[PDB]
Design a protein around this ligand. Structure first.
Ligand SMILES: [Cu+2]
Length: 165
């Protein structure tokens, strides 16, 4: 279940932003450092609120992430596959971001949230958005941040395609 901008009731982007050359080789895992969401209506509310924060507080053209996944086990489309993402605690790696909605410092995401990210990535490969040999990194490997949270970072150690280096 993938909710696009029309389904999470988002605003259109306020301007253009550099395109991503596809397929991309890297996925970067974030957390949103907000409350999590375990049912669609709450996830949609969170998405709207995060988009507003990014657009109004930071002045960005759109919610910063390419994709987000909710504790409801659903995928939320942010900027999508074709547009470069933007992130607090920035980095320049050519990649697509997936933000786990929530804060995973001392709690883990439910299985269904992790499974949503996995499903998103396999679809990326099928539709030629992600290279077949793509690698997965944590935001904190690339920038001085806690993101995606200690507990989620621990879980990632055993993920297929997770790259320590
Ligand atoms: Cu949909």
């Amino acid at each position: 279940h993938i909710l696009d901008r029309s389904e999470w009731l988002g605003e259109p982007p306020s301007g253009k932003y550099p395109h991503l050359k596809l397929p991309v080789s890297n996925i970067i895992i974030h957390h949103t450092a907000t409350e999590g969401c375990e049912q669609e209506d709450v996830c949609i509310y969170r998405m709207k609120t995060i988009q507003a924060f990014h657009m109004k507080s930071f002045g960005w053209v759109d919610i910063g992430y390419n994709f987000l996944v909710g504790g409801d086990g659903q995928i939320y489309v942010g900027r999508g596959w074709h547009i470069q993402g933007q992130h607090v605690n920035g980095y320049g790696a050519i990649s697509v971001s997936i933000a786990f909605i929530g804060t995973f410092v001392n709690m883990e995401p439910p299985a269904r949230q992790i499974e949503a990210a996995k499903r998103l990535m396999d679809e990326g490969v099928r539709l030629h958005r992600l290279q077949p040999d793509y690698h997965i990194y944590a935001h904190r490997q690339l920038s001085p941040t806690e993101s995606p949270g200690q507990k989620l970072f621990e879980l990632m150690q055993n993920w297929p395609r997770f790259t320590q280096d």
